[PDB]
Ligand SMILES: CCCCCCCCO[C@@H]1O[C@H](CO)[C@@H](O)[C@H](O)[C@H]1O
Ligand SMILES: O=S([O-])[O-]
């Protein structure tokens with residue numbers, strides 16, 4: 394099976410886009426070919442769970458890319474050896490850590506280095522980060538940086554592709570919960586529509 398790790402923070406852990414992506418995989422005829430991997434397996438009870446849903450993920454509410462890069466990622470990828478890694482991180486670096494864009498892209502680099510050390514053929518999706526309701530400018534600065542980072546980092550052996558979940562790709566405030574940070578059902582549909590097709594293409598590419 395193709396092993397996929399859905400790495401992230403609360404936007405991965407406590408949201409419902411992962412079931413939608415699994416549905417897409419199912420619809421593509423790939424549910425028997427795909428194993429979602431990771432240390433966590435919680436899903437909120439208000440999400441519409443497809444039957445057969447693979448609940449494993451590597452989402453952690455409140456965790457920062459800074460910390461994950463330095464303390465956790467090597468363990469997680471060493472334990473699971475994913476073929477594909479999809480992530481959105483950085484929201485807590487800003488809102489909790491008060492870190493800048495240079496910090497966050499640096500932490501990206503350290504995470505990707507660890508993913509590749511575990512698997513030099515890993516295929517990676519980096520998500521441009523959803524906006525906060527208040528259009529946090531350091532989040533946008535990370536988003537403006539992601540394409541250059543990808544250009545610097547992507548290789549034929551280990552491609553890095555972008556799932557653009559940003560303001561600029563259509564993420565509206567109407568897609569946020571009342572806390573101004575997490576996607577509501579509309580934002581989950583949007584997220585799943587950006588990630589799911591890139592993830593399906595990568596799955597198909599895995600040898
Ligand atoms: C720094 C932000 C860290 C994560 C805060 C997560 C807040 C999640 O909030 C929770 O969402 C649930 C639905 O998903 C609701 O059922 C709960 O009542 C609510 O507390
Ligand atoms: O969860 S509903 O507000 O889009």
Ligand SMILES: [Ca+2]
Nearest residue numbers: 428429447449
């Ligand atoms: Ca699994």
